[PDB]
Structures are given as C-alpha cells and as structure tokens.
Design a protein around this ligand. Structure first.
Ligand SMILES: Nc1ncnc2c1ncn2[C@@H]1O[C@H](COP(=O)(O)OP(=O)(O)O)[C@@H](O)[C@H]1O
Length: 244
C-alpha cells in the first residue's frame, strides 16, 4: 500500500490491532480513500482470513432488493443473502448510512441474536460473520434527525477507523501520482517516466481530489497518455476531460 503520511500510518497500526477481534469496525471516509481495501485488510489480518470476504454497497439497491440481498429470501429452494455467504468470514457493508430504517432494524437483530429469521416452516439460520461497515455521513447527526438508529450504532461502532482524504495526507499525493504515472508508462511502453514539472505538481497538490485515490489514478493515467513522451517532463495535468 502506498503512503507515508502519519495519519495513514496510524490507520494501518490501528487496523493491525483491530483485525484479530471479532468486533464490528466502522470506517469513516470519503469515496476512493481505501475503505474496501482496509475492510479487506481487517479480514486478511484476522483469524477469519481463510473464510470469505463479501462486499455490498447499500446505496446501490432499492429497499426490497437490499433486504433480500442481505438477509436472503425463499425460492432453487433458497436465495442465500450476503450474511449467509459470509459465514465464517467477513461482510463489508459500504454506504451504511443509506440503509433504510427497516434494514437497520433487521441488521441490529442479526447482530444481537446471531440468526436470520425465516418464513414459516423453516427454522432460523445461524450466522457467524465479522462485520465491517463504511460511510462518510455524519452518523451522530443522523441519529439526531431520526434517520439512523442509535441502537444500531451502539452495536456497529465498537471502534472507528477514520481514513483521511488524499488532500489531508501530506505528500502522499506525489508519491502515489509518481507510482501511477510509472505504471502507465509501462502500459504505453514509455522507457522512463520523465517527471512532473512544478506547474504539474502545483496542479496535483492544490486540487481537492473529491474522488481521492480512484480519481488520482485516472487523472494521472490520462495525463501520461496525453503527454505521450519520455523526452520532456509532464506539465499538463488533465483533471477535467470534458473541457478538452
Ligand atoms: N494506500 C493505498 N495505496 C495504493 N492504492 C490504494 C491505497 N488506498 C486505496 N487505493 C486504491 O484506490 C482505489 C480505491 O480504493 P477502494 O478501497 O476500493 O475504494 P473505496 O474507498 O471507494 O472503498 C483502489 O484501486 C485501491 O487499490
């Protein structure tokens, strides 16, 4: 993983201590800051490392589909949900704050009882899953508004990993930019990355990176491609490809 910023190193140290626990971990961070990567690090550093790592984006599914994707539904005889698929392993729920209140209630019940309720006939399913969740919402604010369950937060938020946005990671922007530029040079067969000019560095370090590391990679790849030479340093950082 790339980065030297104290804020980021401190996250890695925190994760090394949290991973062996069976307790739920809440990751607060912006898109592209490595939420899923950290969730997967928690899994692979934990005693569950040989078990499944399953992900789901709560924001991507309507309420009824989220409900059946997480908790499963009947009808060859059953469509297992993500809790069942994660049994013995880890389930990463991204965009937690978008889960509808009915889902939040059902999530609290699974955490506190350790089983998934079942329609008549079939008995409840036991599940044994280590949960990691993420969002950039202000969850305490949502609790005040009535849009996030306080009880659920008392279960999910055993501890909180705060992932710093790229704009708050010291000089990690240039370290990562260089790394990404070099890999794009290999992809388009340039013999050497010719460096970034001061203008390019100013552009990179002054931009907010709303898309963080995902956005940085894309911008840098496009910029290297457009430059297309090892003869002269890269000067033009193409943040916005919709202008020109
Ligand atoms: N510290 C890091 N070093 C190298 N690549 C990283 C680092 N953090 C995140 N990335 C990369 O950034 C992209 C977004 O990370 P990911 O965890 O998927 O995103 P998100 O925060 O949106 O869940 C991925 O391609 C991932 O490899």
């Amino acid at each position: 993983l790339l980065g030297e910023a104290n804020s980021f190193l401190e996250v890695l140290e925190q994760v090394s201590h949290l991973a062996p626990l069976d307790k739920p971990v809440l990751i607060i961070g912006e898109r592209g800051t490595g939420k899923e990567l950290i969730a997967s690090r928690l899994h692979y550093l934990s005693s569950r490392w040989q078990g499944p790592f399953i992900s789901l984006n709560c924001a991507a599914l309507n309420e009824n589909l989220l409900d059946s994707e997480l908790f499963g539904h009947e009808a060859q005889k059953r469509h297992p949900g993500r809790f069942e698929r994660a049994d013995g392993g880890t389930l990463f729920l991204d965009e937690l704050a978008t889960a509808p209140m009915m889902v939040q209630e059902k999530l609290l019940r699974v955490i506190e009882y350790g089983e998934l309720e079942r329609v008549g006939g079939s008995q409840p399913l036991q599940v044994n899953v280590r949960l990691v969740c993420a969002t950039n919402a202000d969850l305490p604010a949502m609790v005040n508004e009535g849009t996030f369950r306080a009880d659920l937060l008392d279960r999910l938020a055993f501890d909180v990993v705060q992932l710093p946005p790229l704009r708050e990671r010291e000089s990690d922007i240039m370290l990562m930019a260089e790394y990404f530029a070099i890999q794009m040079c290999r992809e388009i067969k340039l013999p050497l990355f010719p460096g970034f000019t001061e203008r390019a560095r100013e552009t990179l370090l002054n931009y907010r990176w709303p898309g963080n590391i995902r956005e940085l990679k894309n911008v840098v790849e496009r910029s290297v491609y457009r430059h297309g030479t090892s003869d002269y340093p890269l000067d033009d950082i193409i943040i916005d490809p919709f202008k020109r």
